[PDB]
Each structure stands twice: as C-alpha cells, then as structure tokens.
Amino acid sequence: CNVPLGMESGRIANEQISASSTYSDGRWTPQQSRLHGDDNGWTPNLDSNKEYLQVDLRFLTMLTAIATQGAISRETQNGYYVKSYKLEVSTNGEDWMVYRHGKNHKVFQANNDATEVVLNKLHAPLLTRFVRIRPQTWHSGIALRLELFGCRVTSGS
Numbered sequence: 001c002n003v004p005l006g007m008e009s010g011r012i013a014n015e016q017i018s019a020s021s022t023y024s025d026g027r028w029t030p031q032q033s034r035l036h037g038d039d040n041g042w043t044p045n046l047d048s049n050k051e052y053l054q055v056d057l058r059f060l061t062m063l064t065a066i067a068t069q070g071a072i073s074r075e076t077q078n079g080y081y082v083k084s085y086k087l088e089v090s091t092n093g094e095d096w097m098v099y100r101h102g103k104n105h106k107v108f109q110a111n112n113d114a115t116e117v118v119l120n121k122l123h124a125p126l127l128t129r130f131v132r133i134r135p136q137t138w139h140s141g142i143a144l145r146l147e148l149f150g151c152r153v154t155s156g157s
C-alpha cells in the first residue's frame, strides 16, 4: 500500500493543500510544497513549532509513508529545511490526533540539507483523511516539500 498519493503528480489539487500561515512575500505558498517542485517550497509566516502544512486527501486513506525535502530559494540560493516533525491526523477535519507510539508523540527525523528526499515509513498503516506536517526543528528556516504514500480504503461503517 505504497502508492504516491498525488503531491508530485497533481492528483492532489491545489485546493486540497493549505497551511497555518505562509511567508508574507507570497513566494513560499502551500501549493509550492510538492515533492521535487522547482519553485521554492512552503514556508510559514513565522518559524515556530506551531506551524503546519495541511493536506486534505478527500477520502479515507491508509497512510504508509511520508517523504520530505527542504528547498533552495530561487532568489538567494540559500537552503532551508525541516530536521524533525510531528504528524497530526483527522478523519473529519475537526478531531485532530497527534500521531503517537503509546503516550509519546512520534517525532520523525527529516532532512539534513535542502535537496535530498528523506522517506519515513510508518510502522503500520495509519487511517486518515487529513494530514498535518508539524515542523519541530529546522535549519535556518522552515521549508518543506512533501509526498504522501498509501492506499484508499473502505470504512467499516
């Protein structure tokens, strides 16, 4: 259950991608967070561990992996990247759960440069419709490009 879900391909439409905030110059929008995208990436308005990139998958989906990169600024050639993040999921867009192992939030180790893809496979598939990626640590600034992997599933109700 390991199919790219549509960040890089466009199957996830722009309207399905959103964020807590975006940098005030308009050059680092949520829609720039697609994996391998050639124009900057998503950056929030402020660098903090409360900001997030949100994706509505539209259907109930088994999430099995997350890929991330940072980005290089087109304007300055400086590199920005997330070093670790949490994941927060919801089937309805209202009830949000920060993904945990037992009582500990799972902290995914992410990038150590602006260009290489780091892939985190989940230990077991996770049911969700909405995904938030919530940077906890970063280098120089938050910047993200993303892919999500998994499969559509049938709800048991």
Ligand SMILES: [Cl-]
Binding pocket: 036
């Ligand atoms: Cl590719």
Ligand SMILES: [Cl-]
Binding pocket: 106, 121, 122, 123, 124
């Ligand atoms: Cl995991």
Ligand SMILES: [Zn+2]
Binding pocket: 008, 035, 036
């Ligand atoms: Zn690619």
Ligand SMILES: [Zn+2]
Binding pocket: 094
């Ligand atoms: Zn409600």
Ligand SMILES: [Zn+2]
Binding pocket: 100, 101, 106, 122, 123, 124
């Ligand atoms: Zn896990």
